[PDB]
Amino acid sequence: SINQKLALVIKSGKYTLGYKSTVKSLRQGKSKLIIIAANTPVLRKSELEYYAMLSKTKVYYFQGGNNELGTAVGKLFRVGVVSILEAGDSDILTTLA
Amino acid sequence: VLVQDLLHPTAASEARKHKLKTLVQGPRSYFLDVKCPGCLNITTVFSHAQTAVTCESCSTILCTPTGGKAKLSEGTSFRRK
């Protein structure tokens, strides 16, 4: 269900993968929801929570590490955090998850 | 019986048979025009709907999926076809 919402964001919306582009999108205020993996380091996720609190973007915690975010967004590499720039035909922003 | 009319079976005989095993196979399912208490608009639903069909006004349930025929939501007003 959540992976289906991620897959519909990838097919129809806009997103950035990785930590550095997510921080840049949070600084630009262009982020709507940031999704952070389970095995991401706690200092890294604490800084992502602070930037999302400082920019008023929602935070979702993926139930699975960076290997599972990479597969859920359709890629063959580990994704530690994915930012959603603009939702497509999915309701991933209206739904809390 | 050793002599029967396969080409013209009884309507009572055909009504109790399986939907596939009649003389010409067809469905026993139908469609309903439902008015919710919320509004007056007619929404067409299926008898074996198997999804929680919704209206604009009372957007919680107009029916409820079951094993067979859908259960209408105990306050709706429906007519066949």
Partner: protein, 129 residues
């Protein structure tokens, strides 16, 4: 899996005839069955048969007359020459004066007597007597 719809039709007719029934319902009513039944009806071993045209394959209700002894299919459809038809009729038919071996031929579905008199040969479908 249904491999020969003609074989399933001829077994249904034979089972209804051996139990003495006067009517039989046949699925799924191929046109090879229609042409085979037309030869049987032409020679009188059956009577009227009416094809219920549903939108998938159809059904056939054949009216028997207590007159057919055995309608069978030869499977596989062997290629018969013009000299092998006498061997097939001697093997399959109870006598030389009645009974017909039905041949699928490029001149049409026909029994062995009008196939010999047309001088045409093909593959063999089955027999009726």
């Amino acid at each position: 899996t249904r491999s020969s719809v003609l074989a399933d039709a001829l077994n249904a007719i034979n089972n209804a005839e051996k139990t003495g029934k006067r009517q039989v319902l046949i699925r799924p009513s191929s046109k090879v069955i229609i042409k085979f039944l037309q030869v049987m009806q032409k020679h009188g071993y059956i009577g009227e048969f009416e094809y219920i045209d549903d939108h998938r394959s159809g059904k056939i209700v054949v009216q028997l007359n207590g007159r057919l002894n055995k309608c069978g299919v030869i499977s596989p459809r062997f290629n018969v020459k013009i000299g092998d038809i006498e061997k097939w009729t001697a093997n399959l038919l109870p006598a030389r004066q009645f009974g017909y071996v039905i041949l699928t031929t490029s001149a049409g579905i026909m029994d062995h007597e009008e196939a010999r008199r047309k001088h045409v040969s093909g593959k063999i479908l089955g027999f009726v007597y």
